[PDB]
Design an enzyme around this catalytic site. Structure first.
Site, PDB file in Angstrom:
ATOM      1  N   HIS A   1      -6.873  -1.095  -3.237  1.00  0.00           N
ATOM      2  CA  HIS A   1      -6.077  -1.020  -2.018  1.00  0.00           C
ATOM      3  C   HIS A   1      -5.259  -2.293  -1.823  1.00  0.00           C
ATOM      4  CE1 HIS A   1      -5.283   0.522   2.095  1.00  0.00           C
ATOM      5  NE2 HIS A   1      -5.371  -0.744   2.461  1.00  0.00           N
ATOM      6  N   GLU A   2      -5.885  -3.458  -2.031  1.00  0.00           N
ATOM      7  CA  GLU A   2      -5.178  -4.729  -1.884  1.00  0.00           C
ATOM      8  C   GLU A   2      -4.147  -4.922  -2.990  1.00  0.00           C
ATOM      9  OE1 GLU A   2      -5.269  -6.605   0.841  1.00  0.00           O
ATOM     10  OE2 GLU A   2      -6.555  -4.928   1.438  1.00  0.00           O
TER      11      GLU A   2
ATOM     12  N   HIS B   1      -1.236  -3.169  -2.073  1.00  0.00           N
ATOM     13  CA  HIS B   1      -0.456  -3.827  -1.032  1.00  0.00           C
ATOM     14  C   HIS B   1       0.556  -4.796  -1.630  1.00  0.00           C
ATOM     15  CE1 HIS B   1      -1.638  -2.447   2.882  1.00  0.00           C
ATOM     16  NE2 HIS B   1      -2.926  -2.618   2.650  1.00  0.00           N
TER      17      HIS B   1
ATOM     18  N   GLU C   1      -0.461   1.707   4.850  1.00  0.00           N
ATOM     19  CA  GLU C   1      -1.828   2.085   4.511  1.00  0.00           C
ATOM     20  C   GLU C   1      -1.875   3.380   3.711  1.00  0.00           C
ATOM     21  OE1 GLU C   1      -3.086  -1.244   5.511  1.00  0.00           O
ATOM     22  OE2 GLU C   1      -4.684   0.229   5.180  1.00  0.00           O
TER      23      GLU C   1
ATOM     24  N   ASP D   1      -3.339   3.519  -0.128  1.00  0.00           N
ATOM     25  CA  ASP D   1      -4.412   4.433  -0.510  1.00  0.00           C
ATOM     26  C   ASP D   1      -3.975   5.359  -1.642  1.00  0.00           C
ATOM     27  OD1 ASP D   1      -6.404   3.467   1.154  1.00  0.00           O
ATOM     28  OD2 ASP D   1      -5.881   4.812   2.818  1.00  0.00           O
TER      29      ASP D   1
HETATM   30 ZN   LIG Z   1      -4.320  -1.787   4.014  1.00  0.00          ZN
END
Ligand SMILES: [Zn+2]
Ligand SMILES: [Zn+2]
Lengths: 418, 418
Positions: B92-93, B96, B137, B141
């Site tokens: 997830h990071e 990002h 987000e 994901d």
């Molecule tokens: Zn996030």
């Protein structure tokens, strides 16, 4: 036969509901809703069909009904219902739509599937839509309030609940979906408030099953706006002692949901000590026990239960305990009798499938899961499972005759509708 | 702009080192980057090197900024039941940063560079905090779960972790800080389940490095809610053989923490006998030996390792053993090579300072201490140490020019940022 057509038309839609809508199949909640609903039906006039009451996992408030005495209630109803008489007024309202044959009489003016598509769109969290005439809604309120009263509920709950729907119809940009299937002009309300004012003043207390049902619905089947808030739990900690046992029950559930089993076991203890024989905490007492692989303890407690012969919740809870405990035959002894006494309960069939699978009785496993697929409207799939079952037993045996006979029955259900 | 962001990212990690409680343990930092880089190798449009940092903080959080620097609070090991849950948060990071969410968000606004750094330091410290849009987000994901499965982890571990976060945000009054930075509405949770369900089921067993990392993090770096409890070790003692060995490791670790060295040796003995070349067990056997003033036994065991020239954990372990054994010159030879090959590892610089202190080479000790201060963003202090080091060597000497040259570099690094 109209009542015959209506009953199987209803069965067709109920089977489509099970197969695609998110129904709550929990024993405690379905038994409560139907016990409350049947208590209303038993005081209704000109009931010509059986009645079943279904619960949807939907945070949008709605309620509707169709042929065969089938009424559908969204789980959001427990969020809006402050008391049991308000929830009863909605079911009384919907019960009167059926007894008046409003939906049936509205349809006399591809069409069977056209209505079924509407029914699931209203039930699914993915939302055509049916609407009743405001005359129809007046008859449902007029007849519903009298069923409400003869059943021992607060008649003022119906106008009180209608007004809470109106205060969200302008203090919120979103018209709640219930107000679109059941439109609420102020005339409808002022007519309802007037009738209630002219009946006897009655202050009624919500049953202890209501608060526990409200807690389990919002706690265990939380979804969207359907939460069991800490503001409400702490509010229940100050109300009557029924709401405090319900508030204790709700935090035991959420402690179990978060796998804090010993925290949940220790919260549930004082309520079980006071009421060692009621199904609500017995149900979770096994749930926490099996969460820690203490299946024997769950079994011993349920064999000591008074009403194990009469309560389906107890019967399934022990059958599931026998399965996790490694005694599938004892589970099958219960479930063979259970499924025969509750042929429409898919929980019973699914557990029988588990038991027969653990016993390596593959033909009987396939037949058990065939019933689950038949109840969900998956009749082609049910027929496939029974075809496989029939291919594992000798021809001329009764197992073959019985499996092939069940296939014949499902084919008749299939050809009645396209 | 990549050149600006990677130097700006260096400024932030220097600021993190100097004020956040970072876990600098060789085994854990090596593990979290081993697994992190394993996810990056399966990620798309990666433009940057990646470093992963572990903060000794019992509040679950994770965030990332310029230069591919991902920050992970050690609480993540408490919430992660399997290795793929941990990787799901890391993917997830990593998602990002490849989408450059934090970079694109800050191009809208334009002093400001330091306001972002104060936010990052406040999030990292246990003790104004960055949060992402719902678009970000969803991207992190969707992209993340695809990286998570390309790496051989369970795709269902992403939705399972998200719901685990929600399941204790309702159980406790506390909402996990991870969900403040990374909002989790039910739309996002339903989306995570959807993308995971579209991919095929994958049963992956966690690496044995994960369980040992979880054991070392919660046992050696215990803090607040981060504890290696007897409940955890009992459940690992009952699980698969990897959890059983890790439970044996964790108990040996805690015996060592409590100076029960002979008990710790007997507990680690079967694991080290089984794989005498395992870094986790070699590392612990050194701590046990040095605790009992057995440096020679510790030195001899680490010289026999295959990966002594390749594994940085064994190199630092053996340098420290040489230090306690009264052989500081042999420690310095290891650390002179180490600090040259790992310019950014503060452990090498500190142990080199201890070795130069032991050899009474004051200026070389001061220059080593300075590197530690420069890595922590304390540039004036590092300049102060190098200035004193330069004052103990002859003018025109090679040492004088180098100490003065590095002062020039550090001051040159000071004016680029405020
Ligand atoms: Zn996030
Ligand atoms: Zn109506």
């Amino acid at each position: 036969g109209s009542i015959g057509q209506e009953m199987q038309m209803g069965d067709y839609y109920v089977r489509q509901l099970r197969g695609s809508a998110p129904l709550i199949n929990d024993p405690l909640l379905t038994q409560y809703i139907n016990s409350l609903g049947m208590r209303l039906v038993s005081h209704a006039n000109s009931v010509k069909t059986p009645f079943h009451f279904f619960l949807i996992n939907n945070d949008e408030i709605n309620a509707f009904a169709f042929f065969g005495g089938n009424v559908v209630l969204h789980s959001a109803l427990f969020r809006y219902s402050d008391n049991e008489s308000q929830l009863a007024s909605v079911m009384a309202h919907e019960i009167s739509h059926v007894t008046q044959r409003h939906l049936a009489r509205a349809m006399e003016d591809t069409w069977v599937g056209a209505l079924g598509s509407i029914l699931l769109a209203m039930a699914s969290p993915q939302a055509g839509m049916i609407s009743f005439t405001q005359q129809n809604e007046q008859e449902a309120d007029r007849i519903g309030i009298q069923v409400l009263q003869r059943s021992g509920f607060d008649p003022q709950a119906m106008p009180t609940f209608l007004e809470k729907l109106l205060d969200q119809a302008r203090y919120s940009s979103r018209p709640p979906e219930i107000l679109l299937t059941h439109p609420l002009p102020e005339s409808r309300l002022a007519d309802a408030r007037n009738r209630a004012n002219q009946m006897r003043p009655m202050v009624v207390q919500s049953s202890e099953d209501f608060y526990l049902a409200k807690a389990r619905t919002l706690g265990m089947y939380n979804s969207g706006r359907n939460q069991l808030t800490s503001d409400l739990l702490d509010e229940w900690a100050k109300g009557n002692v029924r709401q405090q046992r319900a508030a204790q029950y709700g935090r035991a559930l959420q402690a179990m949901e978060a796998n804090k089993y010993d925290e949940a076991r220790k919260t549930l203890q004082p309520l079980l000590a006071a009421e060692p024989g009621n199904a609500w905490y017995l149900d979770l007492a096994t749930d926490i026990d099996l969460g820690q692989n203490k299946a024997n303890e769950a079994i011993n407690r349920l064999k000591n239960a008074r009403d194990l012969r009469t309560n389906p919740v107890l019967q399934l809870n022990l059958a599931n305990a026998y399965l996790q405990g490694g005694q599938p035959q004892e589970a099958a002894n219960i479930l063979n009798r259970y499924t025969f006494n509750n042929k429409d309960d898919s929980n019973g069939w699914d557990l029988l499938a588990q038991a027969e699978a653990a016993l390596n009785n593959r033909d009987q496993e396939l037949a058990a899961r065939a019933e689950g697929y038949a109840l969900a409207g998956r009749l082609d799939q049910a027929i496939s499972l029974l075809s496989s079952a029939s291919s594992q037993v000798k021809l001329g045996s009764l197992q073959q005759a019985r499996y092939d006979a069940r296939i014949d029955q499902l084919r008749q259900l299939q050809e009645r509708f396209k």
